[PDB]
PDB file of C-alpha atoms in Angstrom:
ATOM      1  CA  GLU A 158       9.393  48.630 -18.964  1.00  0.00           C
ATOM      2  CA  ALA A 159      12.052  49.824 -21.627  1.00  0.00           C
ATOM      3  CA  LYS A 160      14.243  51.909 -19.355  1.00  0.00           C
ATOM      4  CA  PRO A 161      15.903  49.701 -16.501  1.00  0.00           C
ATOM      5  CA  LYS A 162      15.426  51.739 -13.217  1.00  0.00           C
ATOM      6  CA  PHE A 163      18.173  51.486 -10.669  1.00  0.00           C
ATOM      7  CA  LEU A 164      17.163  49.443  -7.623  1.00  0.00           C
ATOM      8  CA  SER A 165      19.012  49.780  -4.331  1.00  0.00           C
ATOM      9  CA  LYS A 166      20.665  46.756  -2.676  1.00  0.00           C
ATOM     10  CA  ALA A 167      18.348  47.205   0.141  1.00  0.00           C
ATOM     11  CA  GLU A 168      15.504  47.627  -2.105  1.00  0.00           C
ATOM     12  CA  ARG A 169      16.650  44.600  -4.338  1.00  0.00           C
ATOM     13  CA  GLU A 170      17.070  42.111  -1.559  1.00  0.00           C
ATOM     14  CA  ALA A 171      13.577  43.307  -0.282  1.00  0.00           C
ATOM     15  CA  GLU A 172      12.179  42.604  -3.602  1.00  0.00           C
ATOM     16  CA  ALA A 173      14.083  39.108  -3.609  1.00  0.00           C
ATOM     17  CA  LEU A 174      12.746  38.461  -0.228  1.00  0.00           C
ATOM     18  CA  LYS A 175       9.060  39.367  -1.305  1.00  0.00           C
ATOM     19  CA  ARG A 176       9.665  37.060  -4.166  1.00  0.00           C
ATOM     20  CA  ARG A 177      11.001  34.075  -2.281  1.00  0.00           C
ATOM     21  CA  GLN A 178       7.971  34.576  -0.014  1.00  0.00           C
ATOM     22  CA  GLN A 179       5.529  34.621  -2.779  1.00  0.00           C
ATOM     23  CA  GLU A 180       6.967  31.290  -4.098  1.00  0.00           C
ATOM     24  CA  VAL A 181       7.190  29.519  -0.812  1.00  0.00           C
ATOM     25  CA  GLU A 182       3.651  30.573  -0.422  1.00  0.00           C
ATOM     26  CA  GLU A 183       2.515  29.190  -3.838  1.00  0.00           C
ATOM     27  CA  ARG A 184       4.531  26.003  -2.826  1.00  0.00           C
ATOM     28  CA  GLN A 185       2.492  25.861   0.526  1.00  0.00           C
ATOM     29  CA  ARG A 186      -0.553  26.243  -1.389  1.00  0.00           C
ATOM     30  CA  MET A 187       0.178  23.616  -4.109  1.00  0.00           C
ATOM     31  CA  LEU A 188       1.211  21.451  -1.345  1.00  0.00           C
ATOM     32  CA  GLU A 189      -1.960  21.831   0.656  1.00  0.00           C
ATOM     33  CA  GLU A 190      -4.000  21.253  -2.668  1.00  0.00           C
ATOM     34  CA  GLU A 191      -1.986  18.166  -3.070  1.00  0.00           C
ATOM     35  CA  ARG A 192      -3.298  17.273   0.287  1.00  0.00           C
ATOM     36  CA  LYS A 193      -6.698  17.855  -0.959  1.00  0.00           C
ATOM     37  CA  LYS A 194      -6.011  15.628  -4.100  1.00  0.00           C
ATOM     38  CA  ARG A 195      -4.763  13.038  -1.910  1.00  0.00           C
ATOM     39  CA  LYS A 196      -7.817  12.810   0.361  1.00  0.00           C
ATOM     40  CA  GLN A 197     -10.129  12.969  -2.644  1.00  0.00           C
ATOM     41  CA  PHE A 198      -8.115  10.125  -4.201  1.00  0.00           C
ATOM     42  CA  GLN A 199      -8.176   8.200  -0.978  1.00  0.00           C
ATOM     43  CA  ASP A 200     -11.801   8.342  -0.109  1.00  0.00           C
ATOM     44  CA  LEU A 201     -12.985   7.275  -3.375  1.00  0.00           C
ATOM     45  CA  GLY A 202     -11.558   3.906  -2.812  1.00  0.00           C
ATOM     46  CA  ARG A 203     -12.475   3.734   0.881  1.00  0.00           C
TER      47      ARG A 203
ATOM     48  CA  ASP B2168       4.228  -3.841  -7.878  1.00  0.00           C
ATOM     49  CA  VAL B2169       0.733  -2.490  -6.888  1.00  0.00           C
ATOM     50  CA  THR B2170       1.595  -3.234  -3.111  1.00  0.00           C
ATOM     51  CA  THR B2171       4.967  -1.347  -3.762  1.00  0.00           C
ATOM     52  CA  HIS B2172       3.360   1.374  -5.457  1.00  0.00           C
ATOM     53  CA  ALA B2173       0.626   1.796  -2.799  1.00  0.00           C
ATOM     54  CA  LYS B2174       3.070   1.462   0.065  1.00  0.00           C
ATOM     55  CA  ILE B2175       5.181   4.082  -1.259  1.00  0.00           C
ATOM     56  CA  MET B2176       1.943   6.290  -1.809  1.00  0.00           C
ATOM     57  CA  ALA B2177       0.682   5.680   1.606  1.00  0.00           C
ATOM     58  CA  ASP B2178       3.868   6.746   3.267  1.00  0.00           C
ATOM     59  CA  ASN B2179       4.672   9.558   0.995  1.00  0.00           C
ATOM     60  CA  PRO B2180       2.039  12.145   0.417  1.00  0.00           C
ATOM     61  CA  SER B2181       3.855  13.735  -2.437  1.00  0.00           C
ATOM     62  CA  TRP B2182       2.880  10.858  -4.545  1.00  0.00           C
ATOM     63  CA  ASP B2183      -0.373  11.573  -6.099  1.00  0.00           C
ATOM     64  CA  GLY B2184      -2.194   8.499  -7.305  1.00  0.00           C
ATOM     65  CA  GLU B2185      -3.763  10.302 -10.321  1.00  0.00           C
ATOM     66  CA  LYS B2186      -0.229  11.056 -11.773  1.00  0.00           C
ATOM     67  CA  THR B2187       2.221   8.449 -10.354  1.00  0.00           C
ATOM     68  CA  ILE B2188       2.690   5.352 -12.575  1.00  0.00           C
ATOM     69  CA  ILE B2189       4.448   2.206 -12.802  1.00  0.00           C
ATOM     70  CA  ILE B2190       6.420   1.745 -15.899  1.00  0.00           C
ATOM     71  CA  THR B2191       7.555  -1.925 -16.503  1.00  0.00           C
ATOM     72  CA  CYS B2192      10.110  -2.670 -18.996  1.00  0.00           C
ATOM     73  CA  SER B2193       9.621  -6.334 -19.451  1.00  0.00           C
ATOM     74  CA  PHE B2194      12.437  -8.227 -21.097  1.00  0.00           C
ATOM     75  CA  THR B2195      10.971  -9.750 -24.102  1.00  0.00           C
ATOM     76  CA  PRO B2196      13.075 -11.918 -26.580  1.00  0.00           C
ATOM     77  CA  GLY B2197      15.719  -9.738 -27.919  1.00  0.00           C
ATOM     78  CA  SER B2198      13.702  -6.624 -27.199  1.00  0.00           C
ATOM     79  CA  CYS B2199      11.861  -4.602 -24.357  1.00  0.00           C
ATOM     80  CA  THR B2200       8.099  -4.071 -23.759  1.00  0.00           C
ATOM     81  CA  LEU B2201       7.110  -0.962 -21.846  1.00  0.00           C
ATOM     82  CA  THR B2202       3.812  -0.833 -20.119  1.00  0.00           C
ATOM     83  CA  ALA B2203       2.764   2.037 -17.747  1.00  0.00           C
ATOM     84  CA  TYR B2204       0.109   1.430 -15.249  1.00  0.00           C
ATOM     85  CA  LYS B2205      -1.738   3.738 -12.754  1.00  0.00           C
ATOM     86  CA  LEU B2206      -3.324   2.764  -9.463  1.00  0.00           C
ATOM     87  CA  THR B2207      -6.939   3.093  -9.229  1.00  0.00           C
ATOM     88  CA  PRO B2208      -8.370   4.152  -5.773  1.00  0.00           C
ATOM     89  CA  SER B2209      -9.199   0.703  -5.225  1.00  0.00           C
ATOM     90  CA  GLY B2210      -5.815  -0.464  -6.099  1.00  0.00           C
ATOM     91  CA  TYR B2211      -4.023   2.104  -3.529  1.00  0.00           C
ATOM     92  CA  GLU B2212      -6.581   0.929  -0.695  1.00  0.00           C
ATOM     93  CA  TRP B2213      -5.734  -2.824  -1.357  1.00  0.00           C
ATOM     94  CA  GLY B2214      -2.030  -2.306  -1.809  1.00  0.00           C
ATOM     95  CA  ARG B2215      -1.823  -0.270   1.163  1.00  0.00           C
TER      96      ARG B2215
END
């Protein structure tokens, strides 16, 4: 919110690990949906 | 170009056939004519 809270360095890097785990999970999700789009594009010509 | 595009697509799964194109910048007299083409699913299968 408005007042910035202090976050400890262990807590900051835990938040950063949770963040980078989130976006590597959405990168994995987008990659397997990319595989789904690719299979869909592939079998509409086969 | 469609064989090149479809071989790149068949070897790389990050190339989505809906979104990947071939822009051709043809050298017309004193100018350049640009035309972007997409592969249909018939074209990817044939060029593969």
